[PDB]
Design a protein around this ligand. Structure first.
Ligand code: HEM
Ligand code: HEM
Ligand code: HEM
Ligand code: HEM
Ligand SMILES: [C-]#N
Ligand SMILES: [C-]#N
Ligand SMILES: [C-]#N
Ligand SMILES: [C-]#N
Lengths: 146, 141, 141, 146
């Protein structure tokens, strides 16, 4: 993924304001709420019976933190995503067999959550930059399917 | 398929758009054209610059169409038949583009209505836009 | 959304299945399990061998559900609610799998009904299976 | 793609019976009929207004031959689909900007055409082998996106 100097600056500036303990959980939680079948992969997380139960579930937040960490590491290695995400790709593709469309969905849910948190600051150009990022992460995770 | 609660969530949420129709519709379009440049191929005759009058007017038509769909959420095929003919038979829009615009509409709503964009509302609106999309990409007479 | 012609096409083509319901259903399932191995994870400890009595019995249920869908093609949600509860609420089946089974059902029908499987009927059957899939993967209670 | 020795034999045996002059047109035609939006990429082709018009269209038949030829080229070098489709990938991706999902759709329509023509000879195991082939071709064609 290639970002212009302006895009990189804008992406980094927004990410700096991200609450690292909560944003990932809200992204994962919304994925589980908006696309319910994804819950099948998290049957050990306990109560996912209602939106409130999902969002307030400690395992969802804890795990969402790990997910966010992976996106953060991606931001610092945009030119080597397939290498950086190699282990995670084997995990999600060869072990868990997560259909790759779901990688695209989580990326877009993350974008919705960023828009939710930063409102007007999440301008169209800022969104465009982030779409390139989440598309890149999604592609890297789905590499074993390529 | 929308649940009874989904329809209530959509009506409640879209009712908040109100006079912001054209504004939000225009923003969703700009977000789509910028984030997903390929979608521009459908509007080669449009001035797609920021603040474009053509984009603004078009955004209002898209938003008003959604308002109509919300008002006819129980019988969308009949209510959107003319739009279906336009997008499915005339324009032949690839369905992937509807997923992109729907996403951009959600991003727009989340950016303007933080309090209202709850996880439940987000889910209902996504299903609603997906259903509108299926209708507009279907040829049913 | 299905057109009047789509419904006519589906009723005529599916109507030919008749007593071959179990056979065709089992074949579509075997095609799916062999072509897309990941789908077997939804049927743990199932006897998925060739000619399996368990698969033929299951194939008949799938086929009969489709006959049910045809008989209620204009009001599927209310006719397939029990299957929605099973596939969407309980099993949480990823939608991609429905695309795989739908494709295998089309392959099975093409292989058995040469005269019925015209391009137009093929188109109608695809839309029909896509609509059934949307109902079974949707939560609308 | 990774087909077993038996699968490759099964695939080439059946392909040796595939009408080079018609099967491609039948698959392309059905693509245009079953997935109408794909017609937008073939306006110069003329009349694609009805199923009969599409299937009988001379340009659809002529073009279908080329499509089949590419699948044939893929079968001749299953260990280098990416290299074989390099030029075509740039065409469909960088030039035409055809959404990747459509590549999978055409592959599956081809599988339907093979089933329709061969009947019971197009067994589940034979289909499984062809699915690996069309998946590989679709992936190779979308390589400029990965
Ligand atoms: C596209 C963005 C995604 C990223 C960046 C991501 C990242 C991660 C990371 C960093 C882990 C932990 C690795 C470990 O502890 O070994 C993980 C685990 C996991 N992920 Fe993802 N993931 C993504 C999407 C998905 C999707 C869409 C699903 C399925 C709906 C999924 C399902 C899982 C599961 C089931 C686990 C194991 C959870 C457990 O420990 O029980 N992931 N993911
Ligand atoms: C939520 C979904 C959508 C809705 C509600 C919608 C609604 C509309 C409406 C109301 C019109 C105007 C009809 C008229 O006044 O004559 C229109 C036109 C049009 N739409 Fe859409 N649309 C949607 C999605 C899309 C998508 C995804 C594309 C493709 C990127 C698209 C491409 C077009 C084009 C090319 C026109 C004609 C524009 C012109 O030449 O003025 N639409 N749409
Ligand atoms: C054309 C769409 C489909 C139809 C019409 C359909 C129909 C049915 C029916 C009628 C039952 C049996 C109800 C009962 O006896 O309780 C069933 C069970 C089931 N289906 Fe489906 N199904 C479809 C697609 C799928 C897909 C794509 C998967 C996943 C690969 C799937 C997985 C299952 C499972 C795991 C069961 C329970 C099996 C068991 O008894 O252990 N179905 N389906
Ligand atoms: C995945 C299978 C596909 C294969 C193997 C394939 C192969 C080819 C080949 C060999 C050509 C001709 C190259 C030349 O003679 O210079 C071509 C042209 C073209 N293809 Fe495809 N193609 C595929 C899918 C698609 C799809 C899904 C679309 C769009 C829905 C598409 C749209 C086109 C267009 C618009 C052209 C140019 C036609 C013209 O000459 O005007 N192709 N393709
Ligand atoms: C990862 N969830
Ligand atoms: C029109 N969008
Ligand atoms: C049902 N499979
Ligand atoms: C190539 N069609």
């Amino acid at each position: 993924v290639h970002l212009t100097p302006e895009e990189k600056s804008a992406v980094t500036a927004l990410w700096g304001k991200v609450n690292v303990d909560e944003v990932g959980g809200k992204a994962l939680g919304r994925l589980l709420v908006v696309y319910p079948w994804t819950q099948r992969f998290f049957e050990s997380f306990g109560d996912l019976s209602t939106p409130d139960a999902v969002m307030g579930n400690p395992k969802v937040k804890a795990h969402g933190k790990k997910v966010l960490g992976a996106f953060s590491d991606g931001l610092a290695h945009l030119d080597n995503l397939k290498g950086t995400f190699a282990t995670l790709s084997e995990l999600h593709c060869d072990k868990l067999h997560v259909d790759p469309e779901n990688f695209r969905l989580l990326g877009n849910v993350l974008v919705c959550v960023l828009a939710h948190h930063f409102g007007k600051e999440f301008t169209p150009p800022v969104q465009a930059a982030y779409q390139k990022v989440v598309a890149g992460v999604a592609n890297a995770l789905a590499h074993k399917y390529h | 398929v929308l649940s009874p609660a989904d329809k209530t969530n959509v009506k409640a949420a879209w009712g908040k758009v109100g006079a912001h129709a054209g504004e939000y519709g225009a923003e969703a379009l700009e977000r789509m054209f910028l984030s997903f440049p390929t979608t521009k191929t459908y509007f080669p005759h449009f001035d797609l610059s920021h603040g474009s009058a053509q984009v603004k007017g078009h955004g209002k038509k898209v938003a008003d169409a959604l308002t109509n769909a919300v008002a006819h959420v129980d019988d969308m095929p009949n209510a959107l038949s003319a739009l279906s003919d336009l997008h499915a038979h005339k324009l032949r829009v690839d369905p992937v583009n509807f997923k992109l615009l729907s996403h951009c509409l959600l991003v727009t709503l989340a950016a303007h209505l933080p309090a209202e964009f709850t996880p439940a509302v987000h889910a209902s609106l996504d299903k609603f836009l997906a259903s509108v999309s299926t209708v507009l990409t279907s040829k049913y007479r």
